[PDB]
Design a protein around this ligand. Structure first.
Ligand SMILES: Nc1ncnc2c1ncn2[C@@H]1O[C@H](COP(=O)(O)OP(=O)(O)OP(=O)(O)O)[C@@H](O)[C@H]1O
Ligand SMILES: Nc1ncnc2c1ncn2[C@@H]1O[C@H](COP(=O)(O)OP(=O)(O)OP(=O)(O)O)[C@@H](O)[C@H]1O
Ligand SMILES: [Mg+2]
Ligand SMILES: [Mg+2]
Ligand SMILES: [Mg+2]
Ligand SMILES: [Mg+2]
Lengths: 287, 289
């Protein structure tokens, strides 16, 4: 040392931000790490992905752990290098349920009352005539219908939640469906900050380029996963792929396209269709 | 609100501490953004008094003393704690860096000093009298006083002791840094000409001035050897604190100093405010252009 006789260390704190998920799914950990409640198919995905070209676009995974009588997966906190970050969560795919979940619910189709009540609540004209005469509905047709009230079926993604600069959270995007509404949310999220737009736009392009190469990707049905956008007042802006609770490997030597329409049986998820429109919306906003 | 944050996350902030002046082993790491400085009796006496004075908010918080590993320390805040990659400058304040008692003492056995002559002739071959040249010796007296002259101490009432810049480079050769031009130059580089950083520095200096004018501690202390420590970062957080009271001593009771007046043997005046006014002119002049 010409000038430094010792190193200094002390702790600082920042509030973690949880948009989607339930109370209890997450806990704080040391060294920028986070504990998400353990889920086997998520752990499989995170192991395969640590080794895949997509690695730079997902939080670093560090294995399962046992804390206070429960199992967790340990990963990085993507909030760590940000300061007072804003955050947006977008669920990816033209669909948010696995084919095996539809199959399974198609195997014993018990007529559902509340599912009818919720469906009329959101659109009184949604039910067919027979379904109207029944004041009830199938889990099947409902799972399928739910995807339609927001941008999921038309755009291949939907907004799960937004935490903004004033410190307010929005989570009610159940009827957020059009390009106009989405752009509008993206515009408020971002304060029209052009640098942040372009950054998000370029980050997404990189993710998309890699998804094309990615061995892991071509063989998973990537359902229930999200893009997590994080930006702060310093105009740092990144996007990551998170949430692999419902992403599952195809059988051996088999593959998905991810940009073609889902037909029941083909397991296609529309993930690239989702990502393509996201890329289009930001390009336009970023002009 | 409880609407979005299930828990708090924590992280270690880690940074190399910066020592511009002082000797090796004068300082140690402590926890919680604190630092230990090797114990000094008049410094501790100063800090206690400053913890109970208006000047408190402009000096490192003092937390008392502590014995570790065979040594006594004064515990204090690390003024670097909440900056991001700090740049630091230490300016030693006053028209003199020796106390009056130090001089009186030296004037006592005022024997000849070969070494002091040799340092003087090294720094300036034209400083010694013909008598001193011929004797290859100076007194201590003469040497102590001449020493103040080679930098801006005797004329401007301060001198730069060190700078660590955004480069991660550290300068300490301000031995012949004398003129207002040289100083402006150093500040300009230290600051990279940043207007915002300059104005904050300037206004933080003016606030300091305004509190000294009302400080019962300040007005009855011979304030020697203390520094103004400038710290700023890339986020343009910029501050200045008074530091180092190892050689700051109380005047006799019921007795006072002006601090903006010239020094004369026996008047104990340190010229502290003169130095501070100059720092303010320089920093104001720079914050225009
Ligand atoms: N690694 C991470 N870094 C930072 N924030 C994260 C991370 N993982 C999750 N989050 C935050 O936690 C929330 C929950 O994430 P996630 O979607 O994985 O949970 P979940 O239990 O799988 O919920 P769901 O299955 O309903 O999507 C996200 O919406 C996001 O705000
Ligand atoms: N509280 C503090 N916070 C941050 N830095 C400090 C603090 N105190 C001292 N320093 C740093 O340590 C250096 C030396 O401090 P100081 O002048 O008090 O030491 P010293 O032993 O009294 O030396 P000298 O008597 O030679 O001035 C300063 O140049 C400054 O960089
Ligand atoms: Mg999710
Ligand atoms: Mg999930
Ligand atoms: Mg000092
Ligand atoms: Mg000292």
């Amino acid at each position: 040392v010409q000038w430094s006789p010792f190193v200094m260390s002390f702790k600082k704190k920042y509030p973690w931000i949880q948009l989607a998920g339930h109370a209890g799914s997450f806990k704080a950990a040391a060294n920028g790490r986070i504990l998400k409640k353990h889920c086997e198919s998520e752990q499989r995905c995170l192991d395969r992905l640590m080794a895949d070209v997509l690695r730079p676009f997902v939080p670093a995974y560090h294995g399962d752990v046992v804390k206070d009588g429960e199992r967790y997966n340990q990963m990085d906190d993507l909030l760590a290098d940000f300061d007072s970050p804003c955050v947006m969560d977008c669920k990816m795919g033209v669909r948010t349920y696995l084919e095996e979940e539809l199959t399974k619910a198609r195997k014993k189709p018990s007529l559902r009352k509340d599912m009818y009540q919720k469906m009329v609540e959101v659109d009184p004209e949604a039910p067919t005539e027979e379904e109207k005469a029944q004041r009830a509905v199938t889990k099947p047709r409902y799972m399928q219908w739910r995807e339609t009230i927001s941008s999921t079926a038309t755009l291949g993604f939907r907004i799960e939640g937004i935490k903004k600069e004033d410190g307010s959270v929005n989570r009610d995007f159940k009827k957020t469906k059009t390009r106009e509404q989405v752009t509008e949310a993206f515009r408020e999220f971002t304060k029209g900050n052009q640098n942040i737009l372009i950054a998000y736009r370029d980050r997404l392009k990189a993710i998309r380029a890699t998804l094309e190469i990615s061995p892991f990707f071509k063989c998973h049905e990537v359902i229930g996963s999200s893009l997590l956008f994080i930006h702060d007042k310093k105009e740092q802006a990144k996007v990551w792929m998170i949430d692999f609770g419902k992403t599952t490997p195809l059988p051996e030597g088999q593959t998905l396209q991810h940009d073609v329409p889902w037909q029941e049986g083909n397991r296609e998820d529309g993930y690239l269709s989702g990502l393509d429109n996201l890329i289009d919306i930001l390009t336009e906003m970023s002009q």
